[PDB]
Amino acid sequence: AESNIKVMCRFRPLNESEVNRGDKYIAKFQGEDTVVIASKPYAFDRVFQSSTSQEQVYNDCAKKIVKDVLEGYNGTIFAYGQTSSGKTHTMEGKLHDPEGMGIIPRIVQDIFNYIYSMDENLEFHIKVSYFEIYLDKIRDLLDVSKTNLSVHEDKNRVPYVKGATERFVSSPDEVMDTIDEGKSNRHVAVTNMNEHSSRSHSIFLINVKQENTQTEQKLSGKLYLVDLAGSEKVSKTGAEGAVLDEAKNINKSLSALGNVISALAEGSTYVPYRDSKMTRILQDSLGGNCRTTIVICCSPSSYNESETKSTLLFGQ
Amino acid sequence: MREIVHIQAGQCGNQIGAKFWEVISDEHGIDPTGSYHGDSDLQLERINVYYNEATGNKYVPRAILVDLEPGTMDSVRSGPFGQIFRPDNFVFGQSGAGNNWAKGHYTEGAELVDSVLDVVRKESESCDCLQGFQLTHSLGGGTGSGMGTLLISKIREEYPDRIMNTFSVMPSPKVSDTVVEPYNATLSVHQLVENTDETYSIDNEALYDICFRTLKLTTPTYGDLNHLVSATMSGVTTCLRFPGQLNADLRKLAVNMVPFPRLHFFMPGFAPLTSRGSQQYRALTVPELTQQMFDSKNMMAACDPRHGRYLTVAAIFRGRMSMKEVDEQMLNVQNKNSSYFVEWIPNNVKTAVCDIPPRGLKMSATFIGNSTAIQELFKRISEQFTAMFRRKAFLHWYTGEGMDEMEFTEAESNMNDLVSEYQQYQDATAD
Amino acid sequence: MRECISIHVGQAGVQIGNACWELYCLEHGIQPDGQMPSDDSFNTFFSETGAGKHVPRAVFVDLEPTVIDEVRTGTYRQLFHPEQLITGKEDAANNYARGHYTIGKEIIDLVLDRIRKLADQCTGLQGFLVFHSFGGGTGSGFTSLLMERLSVDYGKKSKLEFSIYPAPQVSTAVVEPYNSILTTHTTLEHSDCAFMVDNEAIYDICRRNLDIERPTYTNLNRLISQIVSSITASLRFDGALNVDLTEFQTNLVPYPRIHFPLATYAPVISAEKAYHEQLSVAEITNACFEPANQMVKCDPRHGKYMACCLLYRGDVVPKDVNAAIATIKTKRSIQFVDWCPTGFKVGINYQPPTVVPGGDLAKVQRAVCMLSNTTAIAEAWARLDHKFDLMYAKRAFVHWYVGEGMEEGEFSEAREDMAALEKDYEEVGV
Ligand SMILES: Nc1nc2c(ncn2[C@@H]2O[C@H](COP(=O)(O)OP(=O)(O)OP(=O)(O)O)[C@@H](O)[C@H]2O)c(=O)[nH]1
Ligand SMILES: Nc1nc2c(ncn2[C@@H]2O[C@H](COP(=O)(O)OP(=O)(O)O)[C@@H](O)[C@H]2O)c(=O)[nH]1
């Protein structure tokens, strides 16, 4: 529901470099719920192990989110993790593979087969917008050469990203092609070790309309999928000023997000939304009629030991 | 870092700035005509924090003076600081917004903010280790409001990496005369709470009360209100402006002062606010100055401290004393006044000590506080904004100059969240 | 002869540094012109360059400078050589993310290279004295980084830390436990032996013991300096053992994690009692166990005692020294903990204390510095524990520190190790 926020963690398996080079497997699973990572337990909703299926994952996690987006609520899904953590496979996977495909092509599938199930009373009209936050400002992931967008609260006092390209989307292929031009236009940075380093939190909003010709009611369904960048120790990376500018921006907004989840998880007094620009756009998505899933993406390798830790320590 | 740059925004921003400058000049031993006629080299030393150099003996204030229509620049050039300002830094313009915030941030001011962006860029590119902008800002005016905010926004877009420290005049709904003020203030705050780093709020009624009742000036003229703003603007810069005992910088204040990031509406205060006379001596000796500073109505915004609570409080002492009261009275006043200070911040009071007092005086204090009572000031502005907006009043002002209904609503909704936010930390506690 | 580099960083660690070196100037007889006037050989801390110029091994490191200005223009300008005066520019006062990460990066090399250079000019290196403001912004952000460096760049030589952990009352940052926690996590790995410094007891002591009114930090630095200087006197001045840095470490804290000791100096007294009575070797040693006279105002009454190392500097009689300690050890009902074996380690040096031309202590004869470790530091660690959780549960301030350069993870990790460190000081029993 709203109250029960699905904090999940999903460990990838070890890779042939991690297996041959021999950074070991950290986890000691207590259960479905709880894992021991290096001395300290971390309890969550669901710890998916490295032996889990994409189908099991999606159906426990994602499938009900979509039904609820559809049936009267909105939904959020958050994906948190660093480069090579296994975020690619969890959030996207590979669409030609019916096993291998993840959260975004499975949502495109159950959304469009929700379309192809019902008949001509609901008028399904999906619009999508794709935008990144990069050095404070909101860049449009679709349309090139903008400075900032305006994220306006309406008469219902809900944030609409004004200035963005909304894509009136009609085919599940069109959904997908969108991601590809989008991801191409992203601010990723390439270093020598860190190749696809994500320097933007990116918000994908699938606005599913379904307004009934019959019952006349204005039926809708906003799904926010938020691509969360990974939290970076500049003691670790050692970088330059311009790359540190990014890394503090990430860390700040991430941490501010955890303060709202903490205040949401508390059910506190103010429950902030205003100060972080991300929590501003996701004002109602954090704190409203939202069924919300946080998918944590970690390595079980001893390379990324303090990264897993730092990430798991999120969930309060 | 080193160089603070100063910006005078609004007819008052000009005035209160020019007095600030008058003070700091006199303080570092510079004549308001031009020359360093000064004695103390220690008081000379860190001049570049505010001043630009010039012909060796003259020092140039690194001011940017913003005013929409002409005439204000003419008043300051006319004034006894006059010639100490370099005429390039008179950033005047032609046509006016006349209080109207929309007219200011959208319409008119657009021609001038390229100009100003040029000038501040020039002085910022002029600097060694750029510290921050300290902007004297008529919060509910038009030149200060809509243009000063438009500028803050250009300044922020340009420099995230510098300290945007504002001194922001927002008087009460009791003594104020500017009509559309409740609109100008909401629109201005909607930019400020998003944009600025540390906003030190100031009230003319509080300055009036300080003069009339605490100090006992007969007629509180503007330059009198300036005497007190300039003193606290002088206060807050003190420790980086001179060598002392302890810390310096305004960020070292601010990092301590703001517990969550939008709680940046500060309340300064000054002391000795003693009537001019002989006893005086049996008003305050040294420890007793702290007892004055910690007292109720001494504050540049008039917050009755029984009415809210405090978050972080800091205190800039100027004069050659010990942390004796900073040991003793800061303990005892947090012990006894326990109701006032929020118990979630482990020991709330944050003192520095600078050796140099104000020129001629012996011990001064600057209070710098985050008073949760500040939200009543916002509550009434938000009321009056609701009233005017609910009436649909002043269309032939704002909406004519292109203000949007969503951005009215937003600024309101932001201001009410600011209220709810400052109020939650009033409410908030320890275990 | 065995050459000890004193590094001092922070507002206070610099200031206090300056007083340390001013009493070392006076103890060793250097005039502010640079010149030793007569025949002595204090080449530990000082060195004569060729002309009559004794240059210290004092490394002043700072941000935007205060004291270095006052030093090279005015205060022993002709003693301190400008190459050893390391100024900085950008800001981090309070802010640990700007300290240990951002501005620390821009600093480190210019500082480190200067250190490697002085340590090149130290031929017979004894090791480091590192003086720093532990909870401070100017201090600990960069010094925790500097120690991280010198743990490799120096290797097996020891870092003798003096660590200003704040008073339960006098508190100039709000975020001083955030500093100190992160600072502790760092020194837990990269410091050799850590002398926890206060403000409170020290000020308490000036009013109770010293009986001057409520003095300025200048006089109070002249208190600390007396205490640092007595520690170093045993290297500086000739006499018994306790020359090595390792001679403290090894003697004090042989349990590897338990590396913060405490200390005190005596006689601290009034010029009145100086005239009025003459203190005996027993009475100064009885002042060594005195609870009110102890350096960090953590309570020795509620605490139990661990190791005890006593440095006597003055003409003392070793029998009477053996008796003072024998008797007071035998007699006082203080718990010497059952984990420690029984015994003090004593140290008697010829040279008496030296007094400053100031407004401070008078010309006493015989003098002692108690080094100890006691369980009472856990009380100090309790304030950290209380105070941290009090903001952290709130998540106050985190927009300044995690927002500007720190990672949030790092806060919990240090919370866990500090807490295990309280379990370390709780492993003090049988
Ligand atoms: N004994 C002593 N204490 C001092 C002196 N100067 C400051 N202190 C205080 O003792 C503690 C030392 O911290 P600081 O040195 O001020 O911390 P800092 O490194 O300057 O940290 P920032 O102010 O954040 O840059 C503070 O609470 C000071 O107020 C001094 O000369 N001696
Ligand atoms: N403290 C102070 N207040 C003043 C002074 N002169 C005018 N005021 C008041 O403070 C506000 C100044 O507004 P102004 O600077 O005119 O706003 P602008 O329209 O943006 O130029 C008004 O409400 C004035 O009555 C002065 O020198 N000092």
Residue numbers in the entry:
A (entry chain K): 5 to 320
B (entry chain B): 1 to 44, 47 to 360, 369 to 441
C (entry chain A): 1 to 38, 46 to 437
Original authors' sentences:
Kinesin-microtubule complex at 5–6 Å resolution. individual beta strands, indicating a resolution of at least 5 Å. from ‘open’ to ‘closed’ conformations in response to ATP.
mediated by the ‘linchpin’ residue N255. place via microtubule interactions of the N255 ‘linchpin’ residue. relax into its open state and release ADP. substantial loss of ADP affinity that occurs with microtubule attachment. However, the no-nucleotide conformation proposed by Atherton et al.
